[PDB]
Structure formats: C-alpha cells, structure tokens
Design a protein around this ligand. Structure first.
Ligand SMILES: NC(=O)c1ccc[n+]([C@@H]2O[C@H](COP(=O)([O-])OP(=O)(O)OC[C@H]3O[C@@H](n4cnc5c(N)ncnc54)[C@H](OP(=O)(O)O)[C@@H]3O)[C@@H](O)[C@H]2O)c1
Ligand code: NA
Ligand code: NA
Ligand code: NA
Ligand code: NA
Lengths: 499, 499, 499, 499
C-alpha cells in the first residue's frame, strides 16, 4: 500500500513487487523471495524481468530515455527531485519501517537514511558547483594562434546504477540523483536481498514527474545483471559493492566510465595527544554502526603506547555495554547481520585471530543465526598482519586493536591492509597530522572523527582495492558525464591581428 | 649510435635495442625484428624481457619508483622534462630519421612529431593549471556544521603507458610527461611494430635526470603486455590503440583508472555557407595525412546539396594531384602504410563500397605491398550505411563522400558510425553550428578546420566506441591522479560559535 | 498596512515610513516627502536618521552585526532568504502596487521586478558555485619547498548598499542577498525618490529571521549618505547609480572594495544577415522598456546599408504604435519618467540632434510634465558623434539610428560613446560575431537579443565610464568578500623527503 | 654604463637617468637628485617629464600601447619576459650593486631581490593557471532557457604601476609582469627616492622586445604622479605604498580597478607548544630584515605566559648580536634606513613606549643620521595599546613584546592594531591554530614561519588599513583584467527542444 497502491500485487499471501520497465510496472520472469534478517521470514517477492523485457527496457532507455531526461531542462529536473523529496518525507515512517524490516537496520539509523535520501534530493542544486565549462584562449602557443577552445560537460546517456544491500534506499536515490541531474537516463539494479526501498524510491520519483521512459528498476539477481553491464547502450556504471563483484563488473563491461566504491574497512589511528574520550566514543560507533555493515566501518585501531591502555579500555567498555536485539526497540543499538552466512564468517575470523595470538576484549559471543555481539580483539603488531581480520574485510561488527610505538608504525600497519577507503586520525599536532595525511593511502582521512560519508557533502572513494573515482555532491558529475571540446578556427579571418 | 651509444648492441649485423628495466638497460627474452614499411626490411631488433624481468621491473617501479618520482619535487621534475626537451631537440634529425624509416612517416610529418614531443615536454608547466585543490567549508548543511574539507590530488603510483604505432615518439613522450609531472612512475610499452623512437625518448629522459628506478620500457609483444595491465601494482593504464585491443585491456585489467583513446574515424560536414576552398583544402589533408593512419583521419564527407558538387570536385582534384612514394623526398606527400595487411583491407573495403553502389572519385589504385593512392569514394546516402568504409574504420587514406539535403541528415549520418572521436563542421551560421555542436556525439568538434590534436592544447578523447576520458594539457591529470579528501572536525571545539 | 503593520505611522494624513536602525525601526531626523511620478502627488514620507542615529547604527552593525551575520551558519542564512522569498511572494500584488505607484513602473514590469526579487532570494544556493577555496602545493619552486597554501574567502564585515530609483525593490534585495549570503552585515541606502519598496523588503527579511542587528535601512538624502560611505567600519560599497555620483562615492570612500554599476546606454548593431523581425522587436523593447530608465536601455542603433531601411522602419512602426499613459492599465506600455526634470532633458536633447542634422522617425512629442512618447531619431554618421544623445546618456526612451557601411564602422561608432556596459549584435556569421565580441569595449555582449540583466544569471558590469566589477549570481562574491591566505611551514619537519 | 649604455647621460659629474616616454628615452622637466642612505651623497639624477610629455606619453600608451601589448600573442609575451629574465640575470652583480647603494639594502638581500625579479619573469607561465574562462549553460532557470553564457577575461588597457622605495627592483618587475602578461600597456612610476633599479629593469625589458610604445617610466615626484592616476586613460592602478598615500591615490583616481598593498606591520603569536628555537629565529629575522623596512615586518610579539620568558630572551639575544654597518660587508646584517627622518621617528617612538611603561630589551641606541640598532621593547598588555609603536607603523627595525594569558588575548591584541596584512602563529595544536586562523583579521596567516611574500607564490594583501585586493602569481589577474560576458540567444531556434 501507500504510494505503491496500484503497483504491488497482493498475489496469494505476500506482497509482490514488480520491476519498472521504463514506462510500465511489470515483468514476466521468475518471482523471487525477499526475506528479513530479523526473522529469516519472507516479507515479499519481486518479479524479475525476462530477457526480452531487459532487452526492451534498455532499448527504450536508449532510444527515448536519454532524450526525455536530457530534453527536460535542468530547472525542471530540480523541481522533480524536490517534489520526490517531499513525497518521501511525508511517507517517512513507511520508508523507515521497510528499511528496518528488510535491511535489519535499527530504527534511528533507518530514519537517518530516509532523511539522508530526502536531503540529497533537496540539495541537488549544490551539484551545480561543478557545472560550468572552460574557455581556453589559443594565443599561448604559435601552433594554436587565432584558435579558441570551449570545454563543457555532456550527459553520457544511459547510466547503470548497481546497488548494495547496506543502503538500499539512499544509494538508489543518490545514484539516480547525480545521474539524472546532468541529463542521463538511469537503470537501477538493487541488491535482490532488499530491493523494496528502491521500488518505493522509484515510484516516488515517477509520481514527482521523472520522465517515465528515462528510468528502469530491474530486480535481476547477481549474474543476471551482467546483461545490463555488458550492453553497449549502457555508457556508465556506478557500482557500490564488494571488491570481487566490482572486478567482475569491469571485466564484463569492458570500456565505459566507472565509479567503483568497493569498501573494505577503515583503520583508525590514535596519537598520544588525542582527546581519548572523543576517540573512544567515535571509534566505538565506527566499529558497531549498523552492525559494522558499512563500507567505512572501523576494522583496526592503532594507538601509541602511552594511551593504548585507556583507549582500548574505553572502547571495550562502550562496546560491551551495547544492547543487541530487534531493530525496532529505540533502545536496541545493534540489530542483526544480513545473513547467517555473514555471522559464520565473523566467528571463524575471530577464532583465527585468537589462534594467532589474539585476545578478545569485548563481545565474541554469537547470539543467533543472524545475531552477534560487536567484537574487539587485541593483537600484537608482530602477528596481526597474518590474521584474517586484518588481511580481509569481515563485513560485521568486529575490529582489531594493536599497540604501536609511533606514528610511522601506525601508518605502516594502516597501509598494510589491501584496502584504502578512509582512515581516521585522532590527535592535535599539525606536523604529525600532516604526515599521516600525506602517507595514508586512502581516498579520505577524517581528522578527530569517525569516517562518515553522510550525503556526500565531501567527496569520498577508494584507493588500492577499495575502488576507483568519487561520489559526492559535485564530484559525481565526473562519472556520469563526458567532456565535449569545441575548437573554433579564425586563422587569417581578421579577428586577431597576429595574436 | 648517438644518445644510444652504450645502449644499442651491434650484435651480428643489425642494431639490437634492449628494454629498460627500471635501473639498467637489458633483457634476456626473445629478440624481435623491427621492419620498415618503406621496404619491408629488418632495420633492428629489440630484446623483450623475460617473465622474471617483467616481475622484477614492476617490483622496482612499485617499491622504489613511486617514491623516486613522488619525492622529486615538481620544480625538479619540470627541469628534468625541460632538459629532455633540449636533448631531443639537438638530436632532431636523428629522431626524425628514425620515425621516417621505422614508421614510414613523410619527412615533414616526422619532423613535426619530434617538434611536438619537444614542445610537450617544454610546456609541462601549463599542466599545472589544473593542479590546485578545493577547500569546502561545512556550514551549508546542519550535518556538517563546524566541519571542513580539503580536496587535493595525489599520484596513483605506477602508470602503464601502452602506445600505438602511428605516433611512436610523441605518444610515449606525452604519456610519460603527464604521468610523471604529477609524481607517478611509468611503464612504457610501445608498439612492437616501431619501438625504437620510444627507446630514444626514454634514454633522453634518463640522460636528463629522470629517476632511474621510476621508468621502464618493456618491448613486449601484444598479449605479453597483459601481464603488466593485469598486475595490481599498476594503478592506471593510459592506452591509445584500436577499439578491440582497448576492450581486451580493460577486461584483463579489471578495476583501475583508464584513459582509452580508441580512434575510429571522423566525419566532416560542409554547410552551404562554408568557405569551400578552405573546406576542400582542410578535408583533403584530413583524408590523407600520414596515409590516413591518424585516430582522427577524416573518413566521411557530408555536404549539403548546393555545394556538394564543387566541394567533392576540389577534394578529388587535390587528392589525385598527390605525389606518392618514399617518405624521404620532401616532395612526397604520402608514404607507405604500416603493413601489406593494412593495404589489403583498404582495397577489399573499396570494392565493397563499389559493389554497394559506390563510385571512386579519386585514387583507387594500389601501388605496392604497402603503397596505395589516397582514395575518395562517392556514395548515395540510401546505401552508405551498409558499406564497410562506413561501418568500420579502415586505417588507411580512404573516405566516403555523401550528398545530403540538410544539417539534420548530415548529423544523422555522422552519428550513424559506431565511433565518436571528433567531427568537423565548415560553415558560418551560428545557429546551425550550435545545433551541430549539441547533437554530434563526439569528444570534440572542429569548427572550420580539420580535426587536429597537436600537442593536446585542447582536450580530446572519445564517445561511443572511440573510448573514454581525455588527454590534453591539464586534463590528463584526471587519468593518472586520484583525489584525497581530508575532513577536519572542530565540532564543539570553539572555532565557530554556532556556524 | 500589511507586513508593515506596526511599522508605518499614519501620522497626520500620509503614511510615514521610518528608517530601520539595526534593531529598532525609528529615527528622529527630518521627515521627507515621497512623490509619485504618476501624478506628482505626495504618497508618503520617510524619517531620515539623525547624525547620532547614523553613528549608533554603524556602531551596532560593526560591533554586533558582523558577528550575527557571520555566526549564523550558511544553511540558516539560506533558510532566512527562502522564507523572505515566500513572504514577498504572498504579498506580491502589494509589492507590485507600490512599485507602480512609487516608481511609475507599468504593472507587468512591476510584477516582473517582484518576481525577480523572489527568484533571486530563492536561488541564493547558486551563488555557492564560487564558494570553494584553493589548495596550493608548494613544491613547484625551490623557495617554497615543504610549504603549502590554502586560499579561502571571508566576509569583509559591513557592506554599504546604495540603490538607484529604477529598481527600488530588486536592487535592494539583490545587494542584500549577495552581501548576506557570505556573512556580511548590510546598510541599505535606497534612493530617497522611492525608498518604500526597500522598507517593505527589509521588513520581510526581518520577519524571516534576518539577524536584527545585521541590517539597517537609512533614508538619507543624497550627500547625507556620504557619512556612511566615508566611514571606516564600511568595508565595501555596492553602488548602482550615475557615473557622476559613483565618482563622488569613490572619492569620499577612499580605499575599500567597490562594485560600481554606472549604466550609460547600450548600442545595438544589426548585420545584413540578421533576422530583422527579431531585431526590430528586441531593439524596440530595449529602447522603451520602463520608458528607457534602464542602465542597459538601447540608445543607439547601427545597421548595415542593406537592412538599415527595413530595420529602422519596423522599429519606428513598433515604437509609434505604443500606448502611453497610466502604468496601471495592463494596456499601457509606457508610463511616466521619474521627474519633469528628466523629460526636459530628453526634449532639449532631441532638438539638439535635429539642429545637428537629425530627423525624428517616431515619437518626439511631450505629453505632460512627466510623460513623453518614446523617440527614435535618424542621424548621419558624420554628425552623430557631436549630438548630446550620443555623447551623453539621456535617461529616457530615446535612441539614435545610424546607417553604416560595415561592421568596423558599427564597432567604431559603438565604441565612440564614453560608456561600456553592454552591446547587442544581431546576425548569424560566426566570424563577424567573434570580431564584434573581441572589439566592443563593454562588460557584456548580447548576441541576437536585447541586453537584459534579469536576476544576474550571467554576470554583467561596466567598462569605461560604465563602472567597475560585476554583479551576478556567484560573481558578486568578489565585491563583498576578501581572500584569506594560510601558509603552512613544514620545512625540515619530515612530512616530505626533499619534495 | 652596462645595458644603459646610450641611455644614461654623464652630464656634468653624476650619471643622469632620463624617463622612458613610450618610444624614446628622454624628458625636459626638472632634474632630480638621487641620494644613497649609505652616505647621504648624490649618486645620480633623474629627468622628470614635463606636463606635455606626460600627456603625450599617456596618449601613446592609450592609442598605441594597448594594441601593441594586446596584439602581441601571449606565447610571445612570455618569450619577452623570459629574455628579460636572462638579461637581468647576467647583469646580476650590477643590479645588486645598485640596490645596495641606492636602497641601502644589505648585499645578500639585494642579490635575493634580483633573483626574485628574475624568477618572477621566468615563472610568468604559472600566472596562466587563472587564465581560463567560464561556460554557463542556461537551462537552470526558465527565464534563461535556450540561452548560454561565456565569461572570459580581457586586459583593461593602460595600468599605472606606482612603486614604493623598499623593493625598487622587484615591485616594478612584478607589476609590469602581471599587467603585461594579460595584454595591458604599463606606466611605471617608481619612488623618486630610488628610481634607478626600475630604469634598469625597463631597459632590460625593451632590449628583450617589450612593445616600445606599450611601456613608460616617468620619474615624477609625489603629487606630480597624480596627473597619471586621475587620467581616464589609466584603467587601473597597482599601488604599494603607505596607507595615507594610498588613500590619496583612490581619492584622486575615482572609479577604476585598484590593488592597494598598504603594509602596516605584522603581529606574531607564540603558543605554549611552539618550537621556541624556530620561533625566536624566525621572529628576530621578521623584526630586522632590511632594517624592518618591509610591509610585513614583525612589529609585535605576543607569547603565552609559560614561554614568554624564553622566547623574548632568545629574540633579544639574537637581535643584540647583530652586526650593523655598511650594506656591502657580507658580514653586516643591518644596513641604514632610507632617511634620517625615518630614524627620528623610530627614536621618538621608543621613548614614547618607555614613557608609557615600556622597557627596552635590546637595541635602543641610534648610530648615525640613518643608522640604528634593531630594537625590542617589552610592554605590559594593559598599556601597550596607547603606545605609538602599537597604534602606528614605525617603518624601522623595532617591535613590541607583550606577555599574554591565552590565545584569545593574543588574537585580541593582534586585531587591536589598525592594520591587517599578515600575522604569524607558532604552535602545533590544530584547534588553537584553526581558531587563530579564523579570528585574525588579516590577508594572510603564516603558520610556524615568519611572514614572507617572496615572489608571490601565495597570494597576499591587506584587510583593514593594510589595503584591498591581492598580488600573487595568478591572483594579480583580477586587478588588471575585466570580465567580458557573452550571452547567446537561441530561443526558439531549434537547438534545444524545450531544455
Ligand atoms: C544608470 O544608473 C543610474 C541610477 O539612477 P539614478 O538616476 O537615481 O542615479 P543616481 O542619482 O546616481 O543614484 C544615486 C544613488 O546614490 C545616492 N547618492 C546621491 N548622491 C550621493 C552622494 N553624494 N553620496 C552617496 N550617495 C549618494 C542617491 O540617493 P538620493 O536618491 O537620495 O539622491 C541614490 O540612491 C541611472 O541614472 C543610469 O545612469
Ligand atoms: Na563493453
Ligand atoms: Na585487476
Ligand atoms: Na576611506
Ligand atoms: Na577618475
């Protein structure tokens, strides 16, 4: 019900969400169950499109969508987005309810995500800061005399937005927003794990006036989405997911523009002059938020000798005093993980750390097929690098703690992981901070705060295995737009008199 | 001899060019013959590196090269490039001689390329126009209050520069220049068809002081270079080549930053109010320069009814009055094509056009295993789209001529090819010009001039199958650099008093 | 009444508008009559502040205003402006009614101005496009090695906004908007000729939440405002007025930042290939809008031989078929001029043109102390330069028409006036257009349209006697902000290792 | 002699330097003596131009100069500057010798200035970073639909460069460089106190090929230069001088573009966590360099309680151990002040500080009509604000030392002076540093280093009485260039289909 009135089919017993085929909601492919991590129960089904429908949708997006999106002036695109924001905002509780149930996200976090989606849509005007073009005069080279250049951006056409499970609502809205604001049509492919919030977002956009043939929502499972990525009518792919799937995406897509936010964890470094209360507080939150299911979840804590004790102590106190349970109790801090499978990996990873000399300082206990206590494992620097928790990203609420002699060792250990998304540094000395900033191989460094992307007010993205390019208000334009250069020739035409 | 004194080995009978392994010239892999299109004779050999040497080179570039390049301040990097420019300039005739012989490039064109390489090195200071960073204040959102961002660029590390056969000298110098100026180390992989100019360029850079462990030159043939592209220590790949190899490159490399200049041809449009003398002159040159072996060679001419006759007439007069022969005679305009194989394709492509209703207006005659007359084939709009010359890029001096009723038909036919590098439009009416600019799906549009990239004073690159991203003074920084965001948190620290 | 409920004093017989003294509405200086050009009748009075009140107001703005404005975060400043927009929009008819009566502006134009003010306030987010700062790395010079710079903008403090009579509402709103958005406090000094719309605007801003001690509205007459300009607490002066008063303003103010939009007229050039219907239509409107009382009113028409006849004919037909009368009749096109004095000058200027060989092609007849027919005077190029209509700006609906042989003569005659605000060029040939663009000495050139500033979507401002600097969304920041450079020194501190 | 071979007239007994009148060296006005502060002896004479010659020069610069400068392509302007750099560099000792003798500058400092001039000329390519223009699409507002804007910069025409006595060489070269690089003609008016270095610079530029009618050098004394400033052919004035003369300059010039670097002193703040050795060293140098005759000379030292003792102690030790004498001895650190008059003021200012409770910690002794020991006066915060050394800028090597309780008091005392050029802050805590950066009302803040403008690698300029606008590589373009906006109208012309 709600804004999905005539869309959802109460076929049989559970609500059946159809795909949006660039013009009409529908689909005639396999139906698929959508379960909740809260009780492993089926809360709905989605109709995936048949091959012919994928083909027809791409064809519409390309032959008509590109033009409907592009030929709608920017001032109107903004109105559409602002209206969509209004719709989502008045249906807030419902968007939040679905996030909590479908994603297992605590209530406060679920409401935060909806408010992020709304703000993002409402602030699309800020993305215009990187809208101008360039005028290049040609008299700075004899070869270009009496010549002139104009460099401006142009939408690419059809952008494929592939979305992960941890921000089913925000990610779809964000990617649709920055792709559409510049004149592109968009194909959204949400995680089949929790595709419902995307369906709600798309409908809200359509109600707001989004060109009906300029957007599609295909509930394709995993490798079925490869048909979209590899298609030549898809000029760009905005992907947020795991390193491994990202690799597969580029290998299937070949030459195209890409933005790959591949996550991995984030290390946090605490210097001897850091505000330890702030640090402990921020680091604990970074470790457990949404049960560590955040691309930028803190996975490693490095603190200099003289504060390692206090710091680790506080973070552990904070972590163990956390109420775990059903996401609905505004009291609960940590809800469930997306699947029993994820919890298995977390547990196997903790034993590994212990087997290699690691000691659990907090948590450690599993609580159910999809429930676990946020864990903090102490580890000696001379053995941490071979531990799974270090070498890999265990998508769960678990982090390593490691005492270090100085900044160089912290930086070294921090750079030792295969990832490079963000890093956090707590301290006050400008020199040490500047050195850390220069040497940490990451897309972003958070000084005296936990890494938090929010609506992308500041650009962020990966280095190393964390991906390529950036998302963010303004910067995202680089991934879904292409330059168009115009060279004017006035050689010998009397505009300039030798200059 | 020359600057390659102690490098080249006059082993046996022909000069043997070794690879540069990031520290020492050498190699212990298969030797390979380098023939000249001028007489299909072997003019030298190159020593390809063994697998272990490729491995060791990448290891040096990554563990040491990145730091030697990066830790050399920009002011010094510029001195290195300026010195290298001086060396190449004093050895001009020799660089030119080798281009003429190894690439089959006419003398004037060969000298032009050397002068381009020199200018590019000497003008590296202009690439600094896109060097600054961004300061983002945080008070424009409640969520970011008392926060602040700094966005700056950083070198990626090791850049793989894969080079084509048509600009063996300039392309290596260009790619090395923009990669090195920002602090990256570089692995150059020239076309095994004519790798000698690259060898000469690298040596000149080394003599100039280029960090010896920050550059490598591997004479690997085709698929052997895949080891480099697929390696995780290679953070970026700057490729100029064919659409098909480019696709393979991304599929092997996976997630990384890329700049793919994939060529394809360029269409030129002539409006009824164009200066026909200028148009005919510029279009003819665009059709035959370097025997059409230019990513931006004109391959299709579209002219409105009232001028189609004169225009086509003039271009044909100009084309047929062209002296073909040995590149050395400053008299010769068109030298040979890179291989008998290329000429075969051109011929088979001309018959195809004729078989489908096409009529040769100039040229058509083959002159030897690697020699041909630049050809101009007339064709009816209602049949051109199925001709090979239209559907594909025949890398040779051949173009189609097609009469059209108006601009919309010109634009339509122009956009009908699978490529989108540049396009040229001759005319004077601002409205018609503006419409053409908006609707031509290409990286660049040249108004009243033939498409010419030169040293990249203006950015250029492809749309559609012509590739992704741009090269050019300043813009190239986007392909070999990554953003680094720094977020400062002063929440509640008294810097701001609620703002 | 209305939003001025408890503000306006119905003292005696006419409404008495007090000044806003940065905290409280009031004033104890001479009261001054505000008459309407429609019937020379007194429609209200304004209370000018006493010297002590001017002094106290400046003191409040400086000691408190700067901080209230600055310490209110930008996100909130935007909310204030958006709210103010809403208030003005719902009180539209009333704002329009007051413009029509107080300024003598036709109804449609009056409504257009109110809608401009509203849009300007509502679009303050676009001014953020020029908000970022610059990060300057220091390794491009040996002298700056291991050094770094950050360049950001800062509000200046107290900005004096001096407003003209022709856009009593919009100009106050525009200047307040761009000054306040960056954190400055503002002192508005409207034309004592029609200060009422400003009073209404300020009240709306205050109702919206504008920091009460960060704004002032002083109804000071002419030279009384010099006390404000010359005061050291006023860091900038944004002035739109006549060349002569502007000169006096700088001479009194001394060293400070300035934006001087000094008007003067605009010449329009018509080439032989122009769309004459469009040209005649646009030029006629440029000549008469608001009875030529626009900084950018067309005052000179130059058309090439082959179209001069038709062009001049059409513009004259259009001008003479204009209904002149009371601004209220949505039928009336031209209302009255601001004062009998202005009409006198227009008449004396027309005789002068006739005496020097000029011939009236339309209008010429005076209709009352403040009413006149829009006039079009033909003139020979060899005598126009000595005519008052050419040498000076006659603020009224009157323009000269001059036949010319070619573009160079048009450009020459156009540049012959002492002003340089905008110019218009109608034609289609890119070369001729480009030449005109390069050689016209003006702040802006309108191709195929009459000069129209609108809300400043495009920056505009003068050259020559038309003033200095620009207004416009984004660009205005340069006049009310100052750079702040921060240089960090890490020499020998181990951040960089020689680079 | 030297490059001034046929220029200087050995008339009578001393060399007679004529003015350069935009075409020919000469002049027929009063001759004026140029004395040296080293021995108050006359070392040369300059011929000031007659009124008719000033008039003729301005006329040439305006009617021809603007075009010679502008019509010389930028690539050539750069060659001219690079050649001029070469000439000055080979004549280094001579340029230095003249600075030492004419300005009284120590040898090392004199050589530093010449090397600055050379680097500035040679690095003019960096000024191109702020050369591009802007392309503004019009579909973000209904009012601008099917419209488009291009914003580019244009030279203003004739720039008046008025130079101070403390950098007779560099300032002339800097101002000429940034004015000329963008296409302006320039009128240099050096301090009549030491105009010789400017004469040498101009000649070098002319020898290098600088358009002979695009530059002038008028040896006009003080108020005689007002004729230039007030002239309408002078579109901009770049002034570096005292606050009082700057004020007079704007009041005479009226509306025009200005860059006023008005100096005043700089305060330096030392926090409890500063490297005191670095601080003492840098602050001492800031206090005495060139005998404090630097716009950015440190005039006030504020140090927090816990380090005030050590800090003040060290700076005093360093100051008193300074060798004062003839600028030639590479041993001498401090040469003479520009005039006996300046030393008088310094002495009267020191007594004033003592009379108001101040205590001399170093220096204090006068050594001759133009010689003095660099002085450091201790003072209680509760009495410093009324001391001349605080309230005014005593152009000499003298600074106040004041102990303070915390940062807020330092900032408060620092902001208490009427000037706002730069400030220095030594410390390591990021929060305290950030607060100081936000609250210091100055054009620039130097963290952990003395304020030093160098060649302007980082922009710098004043706030408060220190002036308006900035100089610096790139930024200077704002003072000698104007925007030119071009608005294209395609309404209803079929370029866009409603967008
Ligand atoms: C363009 O822009 C012009 C603006 O219209 P306008 O006729 O009203 O021109 P204007 O008289 O030059 O407008 C001047 C503005 O400046 C104020 N002003 C006058 N003398 C001043 C002084 N000595 N010091 C400080 N401020 C002073 C005026 O107030 P009052 O209205 O009280 O004189 C008015 O608000 C047009 O004439 C056209 O040339
Ligand atoms: Na592909
Ligand atoms: Na890979
Ligand atoms: Na003043
Ligand atoms: Na003046």
């Amino acid at each position: 019900a709600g804004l999905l009135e005539g869309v959802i089919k109460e076929k049989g017993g559970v609500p059946v969400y159809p795909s949006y085929l660039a013009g009409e909601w529908g689909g005639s492919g396999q139906e698929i169950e959508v379960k909740s991590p809260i009780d492993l129960a089926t809360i709905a089904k989605v109709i995936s499109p048949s091959r012919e429908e994928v083909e027809r949708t791409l064809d519409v997006l390309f032959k008509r969508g590109r033009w409907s999106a592009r030929d709608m002036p920017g001032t109107e695109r903004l109105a559409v987005l602002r209206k969509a924001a209004d719709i989502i905002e008045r249906n807030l509780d419902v968007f939040a309810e679905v996030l909590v149930m479908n994603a297992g996200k605590p209530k406060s976090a679920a409401v935060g995500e909806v408010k992020a989606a709304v703000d993002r849509l409402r602030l699309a005007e800020l993305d215009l800061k990187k809208i101008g073009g360039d005028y290049i005069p040609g008299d700075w080279t004899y070869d270009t005399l009496e010549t002139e250049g104009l460099v401006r951006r142009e939408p690419l056409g059809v952008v494929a937005a592939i979305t992960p499970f941890n921000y089913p609502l925000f990610d779809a809205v964000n990617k649709i927003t920055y792709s559409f604001i510049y004149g592109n049509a968009v194909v959204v492919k949400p995680s089949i794990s929790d595709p419902l919030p995307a369906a709600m977002a798309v409908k809200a956009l359509l109600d707001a006036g989004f060109p009906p043939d300029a957007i599609a929502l295909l509930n394709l499972p995993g490798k079925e989405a490869e048909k979209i990525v590899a298609d030549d009518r898809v000029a760009a792919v905005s992907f947020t997911g795991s390193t491994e799937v990202g690799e597969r995406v580029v290998k299937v897509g070949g030459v195209k523009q890409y933005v790959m936010e591949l996550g991995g964890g984030d290390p946090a470094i605490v210097l001897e002059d850091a505000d330890l209360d702030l640090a402990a507080d921020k680091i604990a939150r970074g470790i457990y938020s949404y049960a560590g299911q955040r691309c930028d979840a803190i996975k490693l804590v490095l603190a200099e000798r003289p504060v390692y004790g206090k710091l680790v102590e506080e973070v552990a106190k904070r972590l163990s005093s956390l109420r775990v349970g059903d996401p609905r109790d505004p009291t609960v801090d940590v809800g469930p993980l997306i699947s029993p499978s994820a919890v298995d990996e977390m547990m196997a990873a903790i034993e590994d750390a212990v087997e290699k000399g690691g000691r659990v300082l907090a948590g450690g206990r599993r609580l159910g097929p999809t429930y676990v206590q946020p864990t903090f494992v102490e580890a000696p620097a001379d053995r941490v690098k071979d531990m799974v928790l270090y070498k890999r990203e265990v998508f769960a609420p678990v982090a390593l703690a490691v005492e270090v002699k100085d900044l160089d060792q912290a930086i070294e250990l921090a750079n030792g992981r295969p990832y490079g998304l963000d890093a956090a540094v707590f301290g006050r000395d400008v020199v040490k901070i500047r050195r850390a900033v220069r040497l940490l191989e990451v897309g972003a460094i958070y000084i005296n705060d936990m890494p938090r992307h929010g609506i992308g007010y500041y650009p962020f993205g990966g280095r190393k295995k964390s991906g390529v390019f950036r998302e963010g208000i303004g910067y995202a334009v680089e991934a879904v737009t292409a330059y168009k250069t115009i060279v004017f020739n006035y050689k010998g035409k009397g505009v300039w008199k030798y200059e």
